């Protein structure tokens, strides 16, 4: 769950796979500019530690 | 050896505010900052990359910047990395600059322009760090134990890293139109210069030289350099040339090590 | 292992030695371009841009 | 942590493009209409809307 | 505190300091620094440059 521990999963450092759920959101850009605004919930291992 | 550093130019990208409250396009944008590094050392990344001259040759005095598609030099002195107070910059290569910093909520980079002009770009940032181990100290001591830590070497060898660069898109321009009577020429110098008008049917496609209309004003005709030639950077703030996108491939200096720290 | 058109050439021997950026740079950016999923990417850049 | 990649925007205009999916981790996509780009020289995609 | 500062004509710095206790916060709701590339426009004030 996004803002907790786990929120990627790995099965091994070195595999390929990956389960991240941390709620990655999309918004409209304004008038006049080109940058992609985004919104996203803090990684959960930031505040794990 | 390899000099993968002649294929990258610098650009120009938008940055928050320039150190006064107003935002405007600024050589010296400022990109992500990163700081995994245990002891508190930041790696700094420009818009402009620094530490070459405008001739692709290494010189630890000349420094790229962008400016009107055109690549002008700056000396590497002045190059100010401010927090609170007053940073310490330990490296300096490509894009990234290394830097040390003491508490603080936000920093600026700022170089001195051609014309000796200071030129700023400032982003929030919480940095606050805590040294390794068990005592919140400031700075080392004498006598003391040694702990494992980690920080950013100063070599440049392979490091397994990737940065992504592709073509840049049409740059767009108004003052190459020069409307004279009835008719505008195209500026030159070797930019072959997209174009597209409205008056008679147009005319439309991608010239090298000077042109000249007759026909109608300047607002029917585009001045879109294409340039070419050059690896930019996938950055997010310009737009790219083509949806499926070509995509490269560039290392970055300054990898991780472990080091002693007392 | 990298691929120009239908060339088939390895990596570490590309046909446009020597000087490949000099001779013809947006040749040399484009085919590179093909080549980033390829695993021999890095000894191809290398070769394209190293010459005396 | 995670590392959240976000490539540089495609501006089609005098014309649209059209959102396709991907097989990546939490991959998100989306189509604005009625933007009017500006860059450091002028705004271009001169069709207005 | 504040403090202003101008050097004299041989090249003296004269100065003067004044106690004031300087915090301001922004309008709105949040206590931000600097402003973001992405957000509301909120109305305040300020002081114009013209000397009208
Ligand atoms: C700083 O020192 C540490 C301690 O040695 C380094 O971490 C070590 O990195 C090696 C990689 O060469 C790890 O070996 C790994 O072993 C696993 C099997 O357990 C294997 O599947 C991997 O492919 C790899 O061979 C080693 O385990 C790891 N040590 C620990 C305690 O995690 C580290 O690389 C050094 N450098 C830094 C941190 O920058
Ligand atoms: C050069 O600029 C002109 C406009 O200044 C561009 O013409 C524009 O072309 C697009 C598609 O070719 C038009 O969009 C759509 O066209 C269809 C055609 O039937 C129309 O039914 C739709 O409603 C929609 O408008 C666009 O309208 C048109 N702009 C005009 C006529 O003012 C032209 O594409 C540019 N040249 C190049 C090479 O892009």
């Not at chain 2, 134990?145 to 392979?158: G, V």
């Not at chain 2, 190459?176 to 049917?201: A, D, F, P």
Request: charged share 20%; with cysteine.
């Amino acid at each position: 769950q996004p803002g907790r521990f786990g929120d990627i999963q790995s099965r091994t450092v070195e595999s390929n796979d990956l389960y991240a759920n941390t709620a990655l959101k999309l918004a409209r850009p304004s008038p006049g500019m080109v940058h992609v605004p985004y919104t996203q919930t803090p990684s959960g291992f930031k505040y794990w530690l | 050896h390899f000099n993968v550093y002649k294929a990258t130019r610098p650009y120009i990208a938008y940055c928050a505010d320039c150190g006064a409250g107003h935002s405007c396009h600024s050589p010296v944008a400022i990109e992500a900052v990163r700081s995994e590094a245990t002891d508190g050392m930041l790696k700094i990344q420009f818009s402009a990359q620094i530490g070459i001259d405008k001739s692709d040759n290494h010189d630890y005095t000349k420094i790229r910047y962008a400016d009107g598609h055109a690549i002008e030099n700056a000396v590497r002195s002045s190059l100010k990395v401010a927090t609170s107070g007053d940073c310490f910059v330990h490296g300096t290569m490509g894009h990234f600059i290394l830097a040390k910093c003491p508490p603080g909520e936000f920093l600026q980079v700022s170089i001195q322009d051609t014309r000796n002009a200071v030129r700023a770009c400032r982003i929030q940032y919480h940095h606050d760090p805590q040294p390794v181990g068990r005592e919140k100290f400031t700075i080392r001591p004498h006598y003391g134990k040694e702990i494992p830590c980690t920080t950013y070497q100063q070599t440049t060898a392979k490091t397994v890293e990737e940065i992504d660069m592709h073509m840049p898109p049409d740059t767009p321009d108004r003052t190459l139109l020069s409307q004279q009577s009835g008719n505008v020429k195209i500026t030159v110098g070797g930019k072959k210069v997209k174009y597209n008008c409205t008056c008679g049917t147009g005319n439309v496609g991608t010239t090298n030289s000077d042109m000249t209309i007759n026909t109608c004003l300047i607002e029917q005709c585009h001045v879109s350099v294409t340039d070419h030639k050059k690896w930019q950077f996938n950055s997010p703030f310009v737009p790219r040339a083509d949806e499926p996108a070509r995509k490269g491939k560039v290392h970055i200096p300054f990898p991780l090590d472990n080091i002693t720290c007392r | 292992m990298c691929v120009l058109a239908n060339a088939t050439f390895p990596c570490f021997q590309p046909p446009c030695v020597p000087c490949c950026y000099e001779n013809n740079a947006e040749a040399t950016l484009r085919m590179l371009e093909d080549n980033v999923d390829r695993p021999g990417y890095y000894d191809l850049l290398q070769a394209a841009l190293t010459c005396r | 942590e995670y590392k959240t990649v976000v490539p540089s925007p495609y501006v089609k205009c005098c014309g649209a493009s059209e959102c396709s999916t991907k097989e990546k981790p939490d991959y998100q996509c989306k189509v604005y209409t009625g933007v009017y780009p500006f860059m450091w020289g002028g705004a271009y995609c001169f069709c207005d809307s």
